[PDB]
Amino acid sequence: KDLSRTAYDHLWMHFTRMSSYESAPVPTIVRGEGTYIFDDQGRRYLDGLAGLFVVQAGHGRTELAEAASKQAQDLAFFPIWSYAHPKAVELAERLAHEAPGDLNKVFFTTGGGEAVETAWKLAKQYFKLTGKPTKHKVISRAVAYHGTPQGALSITGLPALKAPFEPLVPGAHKVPNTNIYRAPLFGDDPEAFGRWAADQIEQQILFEGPETVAAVFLEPVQNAGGCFPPPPGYFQRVREICDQYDVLLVSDEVICAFGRLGTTFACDKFGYVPDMITCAKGMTSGYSPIGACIISDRLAEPFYQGDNTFLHGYTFGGHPVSSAVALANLDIFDREGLNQHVLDNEGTFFATLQKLHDLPIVGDVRGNGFFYGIELVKDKATKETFTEEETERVLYGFLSKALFDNGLYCRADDRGDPVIQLAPPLISDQSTFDEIEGILRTVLTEAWTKLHH
Amino acid sequence: KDLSRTAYDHLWMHFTRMSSYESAPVPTIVRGEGTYIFDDQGRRYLDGLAGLFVVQAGHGRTELAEAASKQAQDLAFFPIWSYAHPKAVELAERLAHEAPGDLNKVFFTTGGGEAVETAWKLAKQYFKLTGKPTKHKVISRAVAYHGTPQGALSITGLPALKAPFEPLVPGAHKVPNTNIYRAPLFGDDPEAFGRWAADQIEQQILFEGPETVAAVFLEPVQNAGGCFPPPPGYFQRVREICDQYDVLLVSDEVICAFGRLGTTFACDKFGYVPDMITCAKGMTSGYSPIGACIISDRLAEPFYQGDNTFLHGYTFGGHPVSSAVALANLDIFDREGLNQHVLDNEGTFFATLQKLHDLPIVGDVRGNGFFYGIELVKDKATKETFTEEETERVLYGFLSKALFDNGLYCRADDRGDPVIQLAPPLISDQSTFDEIEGILRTVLTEAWTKLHH
Incomplete structure (x- = not known):
């Protein structure tokens, strides 16, 4: 009032x-x-x-409040724009250590949509740098949410979020989600359903032409549409398809990472290794904005030669205070x-x-x-x-x-x-x-x- | 070590x-x-x-560090997703009070690029809601930087930042910047140069068809290219052109707001009233990530009727801690x-x-x-x-x-x-x-x- x-x-x-x-x-x-x-x-x-799939450790954590003030007093902001600061470096090391495989490079953002934008941009440039310049398209699932900036929004699969704003970034194509409860086919056969749903990724790759497709974006458990866990065998098949067609697999873990599924990275809960992970939300239990795109060393290699540069960034990505708070949050995870x-x-x-x-x-x-x-x-x-x-x-x-x-x-x-x-x-x-x-x-x-x- | x-x-x-x-x-x-x-x-x-055009108040501000811990202990995170929290409300009111004209609606983000995305998306939906569905294109200046998510990146005018990632979001067209030092014409006549440079916006609107153009994005003082202040009479003429052709003017103040030019909103330094302001960076002196798209009440009106919704958002936009810190930063500004x-x-x-x-x-x-x-x-x-x-x-x-x-x-x-x-x-x-x-x-x-x- x-x-x-x-x-x-x-x-x-x-x-x-x-x-x-x-x-x-x-x-x-x-x-x-x-x-x-x-x-x-x-x-x-x-x-x-937990706020918005965010506040993993709970509210009222004095230890995270004090982590913020301690860092802000010392150095609240300096950009990671050809410079480092200690907490970003420490957090990049920690995230890399927790990530599967050779996912050792951490490109900080503030949010999940910014991370998704990073992953798609990186995929495009990666293929240019490695002699496959037509690879640009992306595949994602019907009804999935992957964020709101206009590249991420192309990957998003909710027409109500998209129709007012189209046209968006070309190249985003959809396949079915894994909602077995309303499966059009094989709803009584989880393994067949999983094989079918994964195989639709292959079909869309063939439809568009594999030399034109860069990446596949999938949540471990899909949020939008109403919480769809993966069927048996699904992720293994997706990984096989991505390998076969030289397409990158991005695990969109903005919701699922940082313990939501009982592991640091949710791809480990289902036993697949993606090429990139996008994450945000629970990295700090929400106590200070930060996110990341975590990237395979194989992908980074060409960008780290000679005069090559990923001309991309965010002022506040990898923020000192957010980084300190993330580390303190992960300390809570470990201690408790x-x-x-x-x-x-x-x-x-x-x-x-x-x-x-x-x-x-x-x-x-x-x-x-x-x-x-x-x-x-x-x-x-x-x-x-x-x-x-x-x-x-x-x-x-x-x-x-x-x-x-x-x-x-x-x-x-x-x-x-x-x-x-x-x-x-x-x-x-x-x-x-x-x-x-x-x-x-x-x-x-x-x-x-x-x-x- | x-x-x-x-x-x-x-x-x-x-x-x-x-x-x-x-x-x-x-x-x-x-x-x-x-x-x-x-x-x-x-x-x-x-x-x-100042870090990256950010740290307006200087480093080591105990007041800002303690504002962060005080808020984080109480409520560090709750989404502004059909809910409010007091610091976001207070900061929205304060920003609205500082903004010119009827710019009274504050759509919080974490970053500047996120805010630029917001402004373009809002423009598109606004025109759909008011019976002008073909209005979608944007005009911005050569060599200008407006951010890196792929919609903002379309508005960006640096080919090196864009070529690896094209195609982007259709509809972004470029006009000359106001670098009088290398003007092809009127290099020694600032007033004539200003008229000419503004007139190029009208030319591009005409070229593409006004009923297809939604918005013009301009920094008060252009950063990329190397710091170009506006010529005399430029913004007045731009505002006239935008009014004539029913195009929205977006003042991209991610660098220029929060005192960089001696006013809270830089449009006030040059005496023009835009339809939207994008801002981030110095809002908190960089002590906690937050930004905003500040929007004319005239633009908001159709969205606030009936079942209409701007289906857009960011998890961490308007964060409690960032909001508290921004208010404390504005307190420093007022007192000092x-x-x-x-x-x-x-x-x-x-x-x-x-x-x-x-x-x-x-x-x-x-x-x-x-x-x-x-x-x-x-x-x-x-x-x-x-x-x-x-x-x-x-x-x-x-x-x-x-x-x-x-x-x-x-x-x-x-x-x-x-x-x-x-x-x-x-x-x-x-x-x-x-x-x-x-x-x-x-x-x-x-x-x-x-x-x-």
């Missing part, structure tokens, strides 16, 4: 229908502690998304054994959510690690979806309001989506899982009453 | 020829205080670029009067650098505020440029090494450029200006001896 008004008048929120706050206060979060956040009235919510904690508890988290399958609105519960989706349906036997009117009234309206009002934050850009996603802080335990399931049961029971069956 | 091997092995530096560090140490900056930085050997350097300090000292800074005109290698001294370029030439009478060999040996090699070794940091991405640019912290004073001139005189005297006349 003062500050909800100030927000509506000046703060253009991201992925927000701003008219929603014409005659309703903007929900304003002011404090977090552990797994909880608090609004400007002191109401408490379980942070069911957060990656192992996630591996040791993924089974019970999944089982706790799966209890919701006895509700008539719940069609599917799926995920991996500390990352799950609960897909809502109008009828479980037919997997019937919602009408446009039901989506507005029951999902955007009733469901999203009810989850928040009953103490569970888990809706941001996806308020109108029929899948509820969860990605709480990695310090979450059985008590957290129980609190989540209990609120979901209450709210999903009520949601069913809002549907005309 | 020397970090040079760790850096070469893992830190892919931005805009860097990495082979330069195969058999030479990486210059490693570890600490800053005020206008100075220190390397890991304890040598001290004047920060002649840094904007006025720059207005009061720009004349003597410029006059001090102009003393270098008596050197035979110095072709031009130009700039505005605390932003200058010193253009080097092989012959002052003819304005003769350097050969490729001279550029490598004398500029990339001798000059850039000598500047650093004599105590002046002022070379990053531009080590091989014939223009030396300067943009020190805004706390710089006459002593700083004299220190700069003295080092430049030493090094430029020596550089002349390296050239075969």
Whole structure:
């Protein structure tokens, strides 16, 4: 009314229908502690998304706050633009050490979209430097989100995010996602489904001509569309196809890295080695912006000869304070054994959510690690979806309001989506899982009453 | 212990020829205080670029370090994705209050390129929402830098940054810059030159068809190419042209805002009101990454009606810690009067650098505020440029090494450029200006001896 008004008048929120706050206060979060956040009235919510798949270590970490002030006092900013500073160097070494294979070169960004832009640009120049100048196209999955700058947005697979802005950067082609719950083919045969879904990458390579294709971008577990884990055999086949056709595999780990799946790099959870990794989000548990494109030495080789230069960069990539905070965050990971904690508890988290399958609105519960989706349906036997009117009234309206009002934050850009996603802080335990399931049961029971069956 | 091997092995530096560090140490900056930085050997350097046109208030600001820890302990991260947090709201209000006209809506980013992407995307959607769907093209100046994600990169006017990555986002067209020192026409008539240079924007709009053109992107003072201030009457005429043809004017103030020219928004230094401002860099004096696209209420209006949404965003845009730090930085500005300090000292800074005109290698001294370029030439009478060999040996090699070794940091991405640019912290004073001139005189005297006349 003062500050909800100030927000509506000046703060253009991201992925927000701003008219929603014409005659309703903007929900304003002011404090977090552990797994909880608090609004400007002191109401408490379980942070069911860890902010935005970010706050791995939990909120209120004095050690990360003090890491920031200690570094800012000493050197808050100097560019890594033909210069180094110690924390960037130390963090690049650490990330390289954790990364698989020969992924030893770290190109810092501030965000994930910036990292995706980096990976595509690097692929293009790599092929120019190695005598394959027509290699430029990229492949990614339907419904996947890979960011919003216009190159990343080409790789993105959500038409609603793209249609207002087209034309974008040429060369981005789509293949099916691995949502077996709605598979057009082989939904009853996970291994065949995985082989089919991977083989569609080969088909698109052949369609466009392999000498024109540079890269394939895949999340370990796809977020947008509603949390799709990989089918059996999928990544091994993708790697084989990329090898065969001289195409680079980019693991887009902006969500999945830094323990979300119980490993530092999520490609290790599924046993594949990509050519590049994009990451951001949980590198600092969100405490200071930073991301990276981590790159195979094989790719870097030509750029490190003679007068060659990757004429690319970001003012704030590799920022001293962010780098210090990332290192302190990884120290928390190591000291508290957060990656192992996630591996040791993924089974019970999944089982706790799966209890919701006895509700008539719940069609599917799926995920991996500390990352799950609960897909809502109008009828479980037919997997019937919602009408446009039901989506507005029951999902955007009733469901999203009810989850928040009953103490569970888990809706941001996806308020109108029929899948509820969860990605709480990695310090979450059985008590957290129980609190989540209990609120979901209450709210999903009520949601069913809002549907005309 | 020397970090040079760790850096070469893992830190892919931005805009860097990495082979330069195969058999030479990486210059490693570890600490800053005020206008100075220190390397890991304890040598001290004047920060002649304020890092990267960033560190407006100077290094070692306890106030900013403590602002970061205070906020991070309370709420380090929550997304502004259909939610607000108090520091983002407060900063949006403050930026809106400082911005001219009806520029009251603040769309936060982390970086400048992200902000430029924002502005172009917003322009495209705006025109779709207001029944002008063919408006999509952008105009910008030759040799201008507007960022590196592939939409921003289209607006960028440096072919070396673009050729390896083409094709980019269609619709970006170029017009002449305002480098009066090498004007083909009106070199000794600034007013005529200004009219001419603005008129070229109208010509390009006509060439492409006004109903296909969305926006014009211009820095107040152009960085790349070597510091080109606007000629008299230029921006007034640009604003007239944009109004006539229903094209949006975007002031790209990533370098120029936050006191670099003596005002909070640099468009105010030159007396024009753009439709959008892009900014980043000095918002926090670089202490924590954040930027913004600041937007006219007239542009926002259609997006705030009904179901309409700008489906765009960045995880870390408007970060709580960055927002807190930005507010504390603006507090320093207000209490110390840094904007006025720059207005009061720009004349003597410029006059001090102009003393270098008596050197035979110095072709031009130009700039505005605390932003200058010193253009080097092989012959002052003819304005003769350097050969490729001279550029490598004398500029990339001798000059850039000598500047650093004599105590002046002022070379990053531009080590091989014939223009030396300067943009020190805004706390710089006459002593700083004299220190700069003295080092430049030493090094430029020596550089002349390296050239075969």
